[PDB]
Amino acid sequence: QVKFFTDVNSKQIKTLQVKVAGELISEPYIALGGEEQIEINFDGLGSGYTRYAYNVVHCNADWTQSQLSPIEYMNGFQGTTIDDFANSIGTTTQYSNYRLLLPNDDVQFKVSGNYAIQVYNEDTPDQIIFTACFSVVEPVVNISASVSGNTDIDTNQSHQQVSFNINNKNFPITYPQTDLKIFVYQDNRRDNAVTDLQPMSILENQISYTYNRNLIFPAGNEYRRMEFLSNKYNGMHVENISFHNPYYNVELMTDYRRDKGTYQYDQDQDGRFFIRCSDCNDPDTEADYYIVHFTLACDPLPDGSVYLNGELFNNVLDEKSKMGYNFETKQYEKAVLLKQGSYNYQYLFVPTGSSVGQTGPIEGNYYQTQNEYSIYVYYRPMGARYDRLIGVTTVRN
Amino acid sequence: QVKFFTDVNSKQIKTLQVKVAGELISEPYIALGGEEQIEINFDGLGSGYTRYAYNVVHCNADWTQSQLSPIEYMNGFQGTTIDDFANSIGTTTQYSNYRLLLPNDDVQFKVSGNYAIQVYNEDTPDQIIFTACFSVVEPVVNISASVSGNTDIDTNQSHQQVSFNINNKNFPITYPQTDLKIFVYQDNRRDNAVTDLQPMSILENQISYTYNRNLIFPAGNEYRRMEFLSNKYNGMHVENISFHNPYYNVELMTDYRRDKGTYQYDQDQDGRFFIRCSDCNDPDTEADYYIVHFTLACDPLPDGSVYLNGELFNNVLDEKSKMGYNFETKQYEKAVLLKQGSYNYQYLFVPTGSSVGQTGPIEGNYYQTQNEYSIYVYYRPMGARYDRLIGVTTVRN
Ligand SMILES: [Cl-]
Ligand SMILES: [Cl-]
Ligand SMILES: [Cl-]
Ligand SMILES: [Cl-]
Ligand SMILES: [Mg+2]
Ligand SMILES: [Mg+2]
Ligand SMILES: [Mg+2]
Ligand SMILES: [Mg+2]
């Protein structure tokens, strides 16, 4: 069966963000009882105001659709209109910017778990233009976790290992080896996520997933950074900006493989981007869209493909984010229309016959690297109709 | 027996900092094998260059002196001179700024544990002018930890609870209930630190200190902030600056009790301060010393005393940091000579007949508050002569 993941399927939709409303840096989850909301933010390109509406899909732990019917999981109707929008101001590339907060006055959630918001043009309800995915937690267990570059297979070389315990004194679970499903995500990436974990030990009030070989991740590197807050000067990692009607074009400085080196402390935001422009008080309507040109100078890597990776492509490894190789210049190259701001990014290699991207070949794997890991604990005892999300935590090093 | 703690005992010494050399935000520990150094930084007031020298004291887990002799714990001599110094430039208040990195070319450490650096004027070796304290870890165990406002005694009200496991597959310990000594510190404070912990459970490769009543701390509040980067404008929380020979005087805005309210997200640095001044490229020699005036307007609190708290007084609760009460103005008030920069601070109440400060009465206790907790794991099997520090970690929420 089919999996729901945050992805854009329309060329007219850009800069899809899923974050906690009001937060600069966040994770795509909120508490069921809580005061926080998820914010889905995106632009539609063109001058047209367009009527978009959404459906709520309840999913199980693995992001396949659950068997629940809407009345079981939401209060409110499917096909609600997205009313909160505004036109671009003072930009070459025209667009409208849209914002949906959830839960809201029209839709509230009745159960925990994974949710997928599918958006469409009201005229064309069967063509989904994007899916935005977030989770809703009922936090009845506490998770104590650590990340170390000292792992079971090496010692401060190229890996990081996650270790955690589920503390459940106040939510006893008789058979957690069967009734829990755990997902662990590095830097909000699904491609190299881990699941099918077994506890190393189970006490009455503590379930330990420590020393688990599957919880060893390659360490990667700090993401590459780039900024283009105006067309007047060259921002960070920008070689030149030029205008070719109708767009400004940002030539980024040339990138090189970083795997053959020594770790360099850089401060990143683990693949995130931030929409910003010089002297803009509302970048969501004032930031323009420029063609950004990425260049990775190396010989082509055999037996796989290179993908541009980060929140800028929703961490999706597909034909949109895959990079072609220019054999005239001996470079991987890609042009991407992006809204002005600060971007993290990196280059992942996917070996042929795999769906898992690797930081090793181009970015390198350095145990010191600051990464984040989100641990999602889903609960499903025999006879329950759906996967509850009973704990979640994000740990850094 | 007597305990060593970071403290200044001379009126001519100011702005003692203990941090990891090169780090903006740090903890006062380094790894025994590692590439990092502790930096001890301080000013001596006056124009005089003065010859200061230091001794290294090895301490046990509780910061009493161990039975080790210098040859057992250090390579190098006692009474080494502090050579790295520079005079103030362009400041009303004259001083020299001193910097000692450890380990260095003259002193290296042979064992892990707690170290106290006692500094003195070479002329007067029996009068210690300050002690600077840091720890050296041989990290042979990993600590997985969490902090939650959902505790065993309440639920997202006024407390935080720390939960942790010591993962020791690669450093087996037969009787950890006897051979481990654990200290847990909130926001680098010794006054309300916790120890004498018993494991709730001991497996062959995991020791759990979860659900421990002593590991529940009051949550406190984000520290108050203030900045005075020049005498020209009034910085954050500054009401006015004025000159009364020989010093500039900073009148801080009036502070009030914050316990009767709702949590306000503020970004703090958990009691730290940062030496900075406008257009200064070397604040350590360019930042001036002004008299800063603190005011807390409330009725006097009975059955205890109020102390100004933070890195600015090395988190020491004594006669230096205690606040007098002005019954004319109905305010707690204190004048402190401080080097220009950004300061975190707060006001703690110490009940009479106690040495433990409370955030509750003046700052309030809010479960949301971002705090840090450092967990130090010391190891001493029967017959060992000293407490090794075999693991340490700092966790936030
Ligand atoms: Cl699982
Ligand atoms: Cl292209
Ligand atoms: Cl103990
Ligand atoms: Cl005073
Ligand atoms: Mg076992
Ligand atoms: Mg990073
Ligand atoms: Mg038990
Ligand atoms: Mg804080």
Side-chain angles (χ1 to χ4, degrees):
Chain A
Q1 252 282 70
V2 171
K3 284 179 201 210
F4 298 77
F5 57 97
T6 298
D7 199 22
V8 172
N9 315 292
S10 164
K11 298 168 175 150
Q12 292 300 56
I13 297 301
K14 300 289 189 216
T15 313
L16 177 66
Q17 300 179 262
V18 182
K19 48 105 92 182
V20 172
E23 287 308 301
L24 184 79
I25 300 302
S26 65
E27 307 293 333
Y29 50 84
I30 59 172
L32 179 64
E35 304 294 71
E36 296 196 318
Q37 299 165 291
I38 288 286
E39 176 178 359
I40 289 148
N41 198 294
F42 68 93
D43 291 336
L45 301 210
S47 11
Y49 170 50
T50 298
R51 293 280 273 189
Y52 302 113
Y54 64 99
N55 304 322
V56 183
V57 176
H58 187 268
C59 302
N60 280 334
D62 68 353
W63 284 99
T64 62
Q65 190 171 359
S66 78
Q67 75 187 289
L68 299 188
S69 306
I71 199 60
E72 291 174 277
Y73 61 81
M74 62 191 292
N75 202 277
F77 307 112
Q78 295 289 42
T80 314
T81 304
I82 303 180
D83 293 332
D84 182 341
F85 83 97
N87 304 123
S88 66
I89 308 147
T91 65
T92 51
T93 304
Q94 281 170 11
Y95 64 87
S96 324
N97 174 241
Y98 296 80
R99 182 149 148 287
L100 170 66
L101 305 181
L102 286 162
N104 57 40
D105 279 4
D106 296 341
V107 183
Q108 315 87 45
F109 306 111
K110 289 176 174 171
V111 293
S112 71
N114 286 341
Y115 289 89
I117 299 314
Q118 311 214 273
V119 177
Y120 55 89
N121 194 321
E122 281 195 324
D123 302 335
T124 340
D126 294 319
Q127 188 62 11
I128 300 313
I129 64 175
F130 76 80
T131 302
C133 284
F134 63 90
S135 297
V136 172
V137 57
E138 48 184 310
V140 294
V141 305
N142 151 275
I143 301 172
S144 296
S146 69
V147 193
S148 172
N150 185 19
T151 81
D152 297 334
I153 65 179
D154 68 0
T155 302
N156 301 331
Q157 279 300 321
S158 50
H159 295 86
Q160 272 165 20
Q161 173 157 18
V162 180
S163 302
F164 74 95
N165 305 275
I166 299 174
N167 304 317
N168 68 329
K169 180 170 63 56
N170 295 338
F171 195 81
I173 296 156
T174 314
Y175 295 96
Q177 56 273 73
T178 329
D179 301 346
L180 296 188
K181 305 186 183 116
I182 317 263
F183 285 74
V184 179
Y185 299 95
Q186 184 186 39
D187 303 329
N188 281 292
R189 284 168 54 191
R190 291 207 190 176
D191 68 282
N192 70 338
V194 176
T195 187
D196 304 317
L197 299 179
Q198 288 284 279
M200 294 323 238
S201 68
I202 305 155
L203 306 172
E204 67 285 6
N205 54 24
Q206 196 170 59
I207 309 140
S208 173
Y209 297 79
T210 298
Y211 309 120
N212 194 305
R213 175 75 183 74
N214 311 286
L215 283 176
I216 300 181
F217 285 87
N221 203 343
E222 309 301 349
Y223 285 67
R224 295 162 194 275
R225 299 153 58 227
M226 164 280 257
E227 295 188 22
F228 62 107
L229 305 184
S230 84
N231 54 31
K232 312 280 166 216
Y233 61 97
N234 294 325
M236 175 182 291
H237 210 62
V238 168
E239 184 67 47
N240 188 50
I241 291 159
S242 66
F243 180 80
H244 297 94
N245 184 74
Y247 298 121
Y248 286 95
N249 280 253
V250 186
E251 201 212 348
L252 296 179
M253 287 179 176
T254 297
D255 293 320
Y256 302 88
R257 292 180 65 172
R258 291 191 298 162
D259 59 319
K260 301 157 273 281
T262 295
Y263 174 78
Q264 319 267 295
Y265 180 85
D266 175 34
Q267 202 204 358
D268 72 355
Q269 295 82 31
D270 296 336
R272 297 173 173 86
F273 68 79
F274 304 88
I275 302 302
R276 308 174 159 147
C277 39
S278 279
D279 303 323
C280 294
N281 301 314
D282 187 59
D284 289 346
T285 56
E286 295 175 296
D288 203 349
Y289 275 87
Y290 296 175
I291 302 296
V292 183
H293 300 263
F294 294 79
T295 298
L296 172 64
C298 56
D299 281 351
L301 285 67
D303 310 316
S305 300
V306 178
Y307 293 81
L308 189 42
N309 182 247
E311 202 206 339
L312 81 175
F313 285 107
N314 305 110
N315 287 323
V316 175
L317 305 183
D318 74 354
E319 294 90 358
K320 303 191 226 68
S321 61
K322 188 168 174 194
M323 280 193 99
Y325 191 80
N326 184 335
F327 293 80
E328 295 289 298
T329 54
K330 306 300 167 190
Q331 301 174 327
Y332 289 96
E333 292 186 41
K334 190 171 199 88
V336 185
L337 189 77
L338 292 174
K339 195 181 196 155
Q340 292 178 282
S342 308
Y343 286 75
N344 287 199
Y345 71 100
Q346 70 181 351
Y347 295 111
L348 294 182
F349 179 70
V350 181
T352 51
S354 184
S355 58
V356 177
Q358 286 170 22
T359 41
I362 299 156
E363 300 303 358
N365 283 328
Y366 297 97
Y367 79 97
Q368 309 87 330
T369 294
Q370 177 275 318
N371 288 307
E372 69 193 68
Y373 298 85
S374 308
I375 302 161
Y376 288 73
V377 177
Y378 297 89
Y379 168 60
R380 193 160 166 189
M382 260 293 307
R385 299 171 37 69
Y386 75 103
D387 286 331
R388 293 160 69 189
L389 175 56
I390 62 162
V392 61
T393 194
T394 293
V395 53
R396 281 154 256 252
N397 58 320
Chain B
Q1 252 282 70
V2 171
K3 284 179 201 210
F4 298 77
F5 57 97
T6 298
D7 199 22
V8 172
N9 315 292
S10 164
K11 298 168 175 150
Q12 292 300 56
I13 297 301
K14 300 289 189 216
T15 313
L16 177 66
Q17 300 179 262
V18 182
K19 48 105 92 182
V20 172
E23 287 308 301
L24 184 79
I25 300 302
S26 65
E27 307 293 333
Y29 50 84
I30 59 172
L32 179 64
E35 304 294 71
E36 296 196 318
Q37 299 165 291
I38 288 286
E39 176 178 359
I40 289 148
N41 198 294
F42 68 93
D43 291 336
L45 301 210
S47 11
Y49 170 50
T50 298
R51 293 280 273 189
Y52 302 113
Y54 64 99
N55 304 322
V56 183
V57 176
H58 187 268
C59 302
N60 280 334
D62 68 353
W63 284 99
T64 62
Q65 190 171 359
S66 78
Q67 75 187 289
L68 299 188
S69 306
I71 199 60
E72 291 174 277
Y73 61 81
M74 62 191 292
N75 202 277
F77 307 112
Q78 295 289 42
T80 314
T81 304
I82 303 180
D83 293 332
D84 182 341
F85 83 97
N87 304 123
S88 66
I89 308 147
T91 65
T92 51
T93 304
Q94 281 170 11
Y95 64 87
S96 324
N97 174 241
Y98 296 80
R99 182 149 148 287
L100 170 66
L101 305 181
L102 286 162
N104 57 40
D105 279 4
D106 296 341
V107 183
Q108 315 87 45
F109 306 111
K110 289 176 174 171
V111 293
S112 71
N114 286 341
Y115 289 89
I117 299 314
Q118 311 214 273
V119 177
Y120 55 89
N121 194 321
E122 281 195 324
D123 302 335
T124 340
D126 294 319
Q127 188 62 11
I128 300 313
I129 64 175
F130 76 80
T131 302
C133 284
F134 63 90
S135 297
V136 172
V137 57
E138 48 184 310
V140 294
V141 305
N142 151 275
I143 301 172
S144 296
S146 69
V147 193
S148 172
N150 185 19
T151 81
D152 297 334
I153 65 179
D154 68 0
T155 302
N156 301 331
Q157 279 300 321
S158 50
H159 295 86
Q160 272 165 20
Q161 173 157 18
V162 180
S163 302
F164 74 95
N165 305 275
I166 299 174
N167 304 317
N168 68 329
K169 180 170 63 56
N170 295 338
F171 195 81
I173 296 156
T174 314
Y175 295 96
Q177 56 273 73
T178 329
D179 301 346
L180 296 188
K181 305 186 183 116
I182 317 263
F183 285 74
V184 179
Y185 299 95
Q186 184 186 39
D187 303 329
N188 281 292
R189 284 168 54 191
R190 291 207 190 176
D191 68 282
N192 70 338
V194 176
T195 187
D196 304 317
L197 299 179
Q198 288 284 279
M200 294 323 238
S201 68
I202 305 155
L203 306 172
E204 67 285 6
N205 54 24
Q206 196 170 59
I207 309 140
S208 173
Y209 297 79
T210 298
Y211 309 120
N212 194 305
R213 175 75 183 74
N214 311 286
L215 283 176
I216 300 181
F217 285 87
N221 203 343
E222 309 301 349
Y223 285 67
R224 295 162 194 275
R225 299 153 58 227
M226 164 280 257
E227 295 188 22
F228 62 107
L229 305 184
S230 84
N231 54 31
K232 312 280 166 216
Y233 61 97
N234 294 325
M236 175 182 291
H237 210 62
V238 168
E239 184 67 47
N240 188 50
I241 291 159
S242 66
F243 180 80
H244 297 94
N245 184 74
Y247 298 121
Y248 286 95
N249 280 253
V250 186
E251 201 212 348
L252 296 179
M253 287 179 176
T254 297
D255 293 320
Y256 302 88
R257 292 180 65 172
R258 291 191 298 162
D259 59 319
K260 301 157 273 281
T262 295
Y263 174 78
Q264 319 267 295
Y265 180 85
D266 175 34
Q267 202 204 358
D268 72 355
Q269 295 82 31
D270 296 336
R272 297 173 173 86
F273 68 79
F274 304 88
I275 302 302
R276 308 174 159 147
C277 39
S278 279
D279 303 323
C280 294
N281 301 314
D282 187 59
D284 289 346
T285 56
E286 295 175 296
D288 203 349
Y289 275 87
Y290 296 175
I291 302 296
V292 183
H293 300 263
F294 294 79
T295 298
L296 172 64
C298 56
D299 281 351
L301 285 67
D303 310 316
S305 300
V306 178
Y307 293 81
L308 189 42
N309 182 247
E311 202 206 339
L312 81 175
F313 285 107
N314 305 110
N315 287 323
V316 175
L317 305 183
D318 74 354
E319 294 90 358
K320 303 191 226 68
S321 61
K322 188 168 174 194
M323 280 193 99
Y325 191 80
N326 184 335
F327 293 80
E328 295 289 298
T329 54
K330 306 300 167 190
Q331 301 174 327
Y332 289 96
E333 292 186 41
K334 190 171 199 88
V336 185
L337 189 77
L338 292 174
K339 195 181 196 155
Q340 292 178 282
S342 308
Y343 286 75
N344 287 199
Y345 71 100
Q346 70 181 351
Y347 295 111
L348 294 182
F349 179 70
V350 181
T352 51
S354 184
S355 58
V356 177
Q358 286 170 22
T359 41
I362 299 156
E363 300 303 358
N365 283 328
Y366 297 97
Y367 79 97
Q368 309 87 330
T369 294
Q370 177 275 318
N371 288 307
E372 69 193 68
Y373 298 85
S374 308
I375 302 161
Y376 288 73
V377 177
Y378 297 89
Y379 168 60
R380 193 160 166 189
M382 260 293 307
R385 299 171 37 69
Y386 75 103
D387 286 331
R388 293 160 69 189
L389 175 56
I390 62 162
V392 61
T393 194
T394 293
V395 53
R396 281 154 256 252
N397 58 320

